[PDB]
Symmetry: D2
Subunit: 462 residues, 4 copies
């Protein structure tokens, strides 16, 4: 009568434990205080962690070392990073059509951005694990315990669903592994075929109210593709498209149980977080002496740190020295989210000070999380013009300083939602009640995200 099915888990034999030396390092790191963690009992968390220690990984080390090399190129100014997907993934919407939509939107943006940048685009999805979020307050407008993502509790507004349930750590892995199996399948079959992808852009150009504005660039791209074909370059020549998985490393019970030690065939064994390919640390959990930063020191994965308007140049240097102690280009990404009214003033000093350290970080724009406001109709929202403008300001800072505008980080979807105001749709406050489906922040819908890619490409062409 709860409309729910229960899946038993047996406490099955664990694989040989992690080596004692790394466990000691790891235990030292997680002794530090950890903001934003779930409040579930510890014996129960341990039981779920023991299950996760034994499951097949979501990613494998060799894919992560591959990503590291591709991101190294981004840091050196010869590549561009595209990172995008849902603000919050839900288990109920973790379906083939939704997954296919988001993959498709990301591929569409990537080809437009590749042409604009005239250099390779690394495609990183917010997918297969983006199931946890922080909150500012512990009581929401409905008087309930806050929703903190499907890894922690349920979205539905009732007390039973909002209690912190550690079994969701395993339900999270099941959904993540299944989502990733599908991403891998899609990217290695027709969906990622270049000539198929631009034909979607041709449907966008015909059915956009501002399609006449983007016709020139769309046509230009189409002729670049036919040029390749005409020069005797076929699909299988290009090779399969690669879409990496990422999420905010927020719930340490999950991330630590997904840790694995590498083969040692490559050379030296090391701890990888195999819940994803890359992870980032959020604005509310980046305490310099906190457990999240310390966790990121111990793992080999490429990492990111969100930098909001309170950031100082000095604190940014500390992040560079702690998270890139061996000076590996593209190991650390700094993700500026300042707001379009503040980025032109606040970012330059941070960039200058970090460049002076001699490290090579990736400068990445998040034009979303600095530009959120509430509408008069009641829906939390963002304006497309303000999103565009911060990317514009981001690029101007780098063009002025002679540094690399290394990528973008956006919240998008392949669904035709009504969540962000503006775009060629020119969506209104009234329109938001039509299809407002996000479980957290508002996303660019399929048309808007494409429109944004076209605009960021023109910024790459200047």
């Amino acid at each position: 009568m709860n409309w729910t099915v229960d899946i038993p888990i047996d406490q099955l034999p664990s694989l040989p434990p992690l080596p004692t030396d790394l466990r000691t390092r790891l235990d030292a790191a997680l002794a530090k205080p950890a903001a934003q963690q779930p409040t579930w009992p510890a014996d129960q968390a341990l039981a779920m962690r023991t299950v996760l220690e034994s499951v097949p990984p979501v990613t494998v080390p060799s894919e992560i070392v591959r990503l590291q090399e591709q991101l190294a190129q981004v840091a050196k100014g010869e590549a561009f990073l595209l990172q995008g997907g849902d603000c919050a993934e839900t288990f109920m919407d973790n379906t083939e059509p939704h997954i296919r939509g988001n993959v498709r939107a990301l591929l569409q943006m990537a080809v437009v951005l590749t042409y604009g940048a005239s250099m390779p685009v690394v495609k990183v999805a917010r997918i297969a694990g983006q199931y946890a979020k922080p909150r500012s307050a512990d009581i929401d407008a409905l008087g309930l315990r806050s929703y903190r993502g499907d890894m922690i509790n349920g979205f539905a507004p009732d007390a039973a669903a909002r209690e912190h349930d550690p079994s969701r750590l395993v339900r999270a892995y099941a959904n993540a592994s299944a989502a990733m199996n599908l991403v891998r399948a899609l990217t290695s079959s027709g969906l990622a075929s270049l000539h198929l992808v631009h034909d979607w852009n041709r449907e966008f150009v015909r059915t956009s109210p501002a399609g006449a504005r983007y016709e020139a660039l769309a046509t230009e791209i189409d002729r670049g593709l036919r040029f390749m074909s005409a020069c005797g370059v076929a699909d299988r020549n290009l090779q399969t498209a690669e879409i990496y998985a990422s999420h905010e490393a927020l719930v340490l019970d999950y991330e630590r149980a997904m840790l694995r030690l590498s083969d040692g065939d490559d050379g030296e064994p090391q701890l990888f977080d195999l819940s994803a390919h890359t992870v980032w640390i959020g604005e509310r959990t980046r305490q310099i002496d906190g457990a999240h930063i310390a966790f990121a020191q111990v793992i080999a994965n490429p990492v990111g740190v969100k930098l909001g308007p309170n950031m100082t140049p000095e604190l940014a240097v500390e992040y560079v020295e702690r998270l890139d102690p061996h000076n590996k280009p593209g190991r650390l990404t700094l993700v500026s989210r300042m707001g379009n009214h503040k980025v032109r003033d606040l970012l330059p000093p941070i960039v200058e000070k970090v460049q002076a350290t001699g490290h090579q970080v990736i400068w990445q724009c998040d034009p979303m999380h600095g530009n959120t406001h509430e509408s008069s109709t009641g829906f939390k929202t963002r304006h497309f013009d303000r999103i565009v403008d911060e990317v514009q300001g981001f690029f101007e800072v780098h063009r002025a300083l002679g540094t690399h505008p290394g990528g973008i980080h956006v919240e998008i979807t392949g669904e035709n939602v009504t969540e962000c105001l503006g775009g060629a749709q020119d969506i209104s406050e009234t329109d938001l009640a039509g299809r407002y489906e996000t479980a957290c922040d508002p996303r660019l819908n399929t048309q808007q995200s494409l429109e944004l890619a076209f605009l960021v490409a023109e910024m790459l062409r200047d």
Copy 2:
């Protein structure tokens, strides 16, 4: 303890004929099904109708083309893995081992056959088995694989539990993710795979017998490299997923309808790339055969010693009505003592129909006996001999010995007798770990690939 899934309180409807044909198939009698309550099965089916598929249609169409080459005599099929996967052993080391053993056998067979080898694993779903008796030798309700019931000999664990339909998908999907990750990784690199054959040659008691062929293979690989062919030039290694389509509650919930980018909409079973129908579930007017008629996936049918040439024609005509080479595989499982006498007349009739099926040898399931120590077992020499007889039948008739279907593992278990290890009946109790039939261990499967390669060379 438990994790919990929300049934969707809440997908555009099937074309009318497919709905009609699907209902008609599943209305027919079905052997070997679980006995759990319908309202619970329905709830599980509704969850599985919403999950991301294990495979996609374009992969199955691709498999269909590659299998067509096998049917035509221009490729060879290698199918292998656990007799029964367990949720307990669905781990990275176990999956990686089985993937590795298959890749190793494959390269040896490629070289011996002088033609491409299609690699199909029994994996990411092989969670159900049929039984002859519903009461086992301990007086318990029989184990029928982790989809239906638990391996442990306890009444409570043997109860049929429909929540295992969803746990089985969770494990299948997680396993397939890893298979895809590994196969795009180095693990599938030709040069890496050959270096495992060197380890085997050095640490086998019969290594000296397989050295000449191993050295010849190694030189074949270095020749490619010297002619200017690098890893990245090669097409990425492809390992397809298969299992027996046994539990119809599972297979029907994993059905999806294709797009119209390539022809008319069709039903694909996306729990796997290819499935087969077993000896006990193969009734000509039963639900399993009829389900196979409605799905677009390539299929196989197991054929034992009671098979007639006439029944075989009927299977081909029902399951390959449009004469699509490689859509149907006939899986011969006769026993080494009977295959030479029983297979030829079946092959002759089927060839005369004009259809192009893949003839595949299963040398395992016709050669089981019980040891004096108490473990059910197979002798390595009997396994080799059925494949040998299978090859002779096809050489004599001039037809294509199209492939093998074997139960193997990448661990050094002690389940099948013999091989260069000369495993005795006493040795079986050391590492007998299978949840059902005895598998060739890592050395024995490798030994078999070498021996079958020589059969391909003659």
Copy 3:
């Protein structure tokens, strides 16, 4: 004291003769009257032919069957033919720098045209054998026997040099084979590298007086190339560029001694003319019952026929039926040279009548040979605007009829000559005396030819 060296030839053992059946066919064909042939003695011609029967061929059959397949695509509307080079090759200018220049110009035009057409361009050079020309009158303005090309006599204005010398048949082969060895070498090494070729177009855009007009398309092409690179397509992926050799089959003594019989490994043996890959028959030698047309019936090579303003639709059908009796697309090319003032009127009926036959010919524009006039400064010349305009009219005829404008045939050079009037240079009648170096017709210089390619590409884009 004649400033000349004599190279002995020994009458060395001939290879086994051609088979008797083909020789009988061939003898029947060459019994027909042959316009424009040299007047040298027959015993002497025989001696040189016997030498040529024994030499290594300029081309090989498998290359010609390859060309046939590529031209088949042109005829079916999925490819474009570029044919170009000197009006008349001279032995004295058959040098590495001159050869490299012409190859380079052709490659430059090809990449611009490939992008414009969005389909593959077959590159055929007028090279390695274009050493013979017809004449209208037998006495030139200087009162001497006419120059008829280096295969026949010398350009210098003196009686000794103008006598018809059959040893030039062998000197012609020596130069042809040597030129081709170099073309093969250049095309299989860096010169034909796509990314190298467009950088020359970047030097053209900067140093053309009309460079600002062609900047947009040049930039667009450059971004198409970087797109390929960014998608992970390297040089060796594309494969080596192919440049085929062609000339007017005019001197039958030469063409018939260069005939060879194919291996028979492909299937059926057949006569190929191995002096070139493809040859064409000129306006003054295309007598329907003449030896040139009959010769073209017997060889397996792809052929062309020049169609001037006197052409009728009926006579064009006869050419199609005689030269394409087995209906092989791209085996026959019809080369319209009408003049820009006449093409829009005269070509349409010819096209309609030939389409009605059911054959698939290649429609090729020669905008040069219909637009020649004499300047007030004394130099035979052509105006760039009139050349451009006939290609324009050619395209309009095909766009109107729904048929394929299959290619162009031009006389160009990689030298900065002053021979054709106009272009962005806007060369004048006065300017012609600067660098007028052609041994026959005026050629588009390096800048003009490129300018023409840019203009024909825009015609392909509409």
Copy 4:
């Protein structure tokens, strides 16, 4: 009769140092040169300064990189063709045969070596030879190859004629055009080339001895194909042109200056890709060695039984002053009876210098004798044995046996004694067609490739 070329009554000037170094090299004494008048040589040189080159610089830089791999022990060099090309036999069938034999030997050697084979033909220029006596056994002025004089034994034909400088370029250029055409054609297709080995195995008297290796090679090729590697995947077959740089009037007129797209301007001899300096022209302060110092081409030096370890070091230091691996090849030609004793100490000293040269065996030129029937000849067993001794020296020292340099033809001549054909002294008069030294025929060269492949396998 004759064709006639216009000397150009009428090229931007060489950098001052290159001019200086070139003049200084050619001012030194030069052995074995033709004795024709200077004003006529100058006129011929002026014509050749204007012709399209036989090779281009980027091909030579490419050859230099591939030869570097040989020097490092990661590739093998095959060099072969006519002892002396003739203008009379410079025909399509003769060129195609020699190209074919080289491609055939190459694939066998690739498989035996398990590493890439650089293919260098003696072709498109091998028109000059040295002589010990200026009067031959008939009392005529000696034949010195078609560049200088005619083969026929007539005083008039033996006169040194400088017009042969231009006739030699004409033939060289025409031959190279065809080589390039053939190598981009099917003729260079791996699968085609192996089918010629099958013909050889069936129609050799010793075919049964080479069948196992032939079958193994065939299976190596089918393995590539089965792993999804097609012709078009492979890099196009490359055959480089070489000859002895003997006639300095020829080589100097064929010099061209490079561009600055890759470093400083340099002189390339574009009559070939690589050239070598012979035993009789190898004087340390002579014009040939000094000419070799000024050109960018990879070079070789022939080393006979009088060679010292010390003189060898001097050649390496003069010819590889910048320590560029594979820029220099040392070509051992000792005699099968002497190579085991005479080569080791030379190899030891040269290795100690720190330079990386290619050690190449010439098993031909140390093993000539005169038969009782009157034809100069070599025995197949002696040729094989020098290569065998050459391999032993390098195995014992742990150095790289880098290649072979042989005189072969794609026609079945009767010039060298022995082989599976067991050609006798009586048989020599059947088809003795060489214009100088006896060449291994089409069967014998192939037989040698097989035998050298086994030496590479041990």
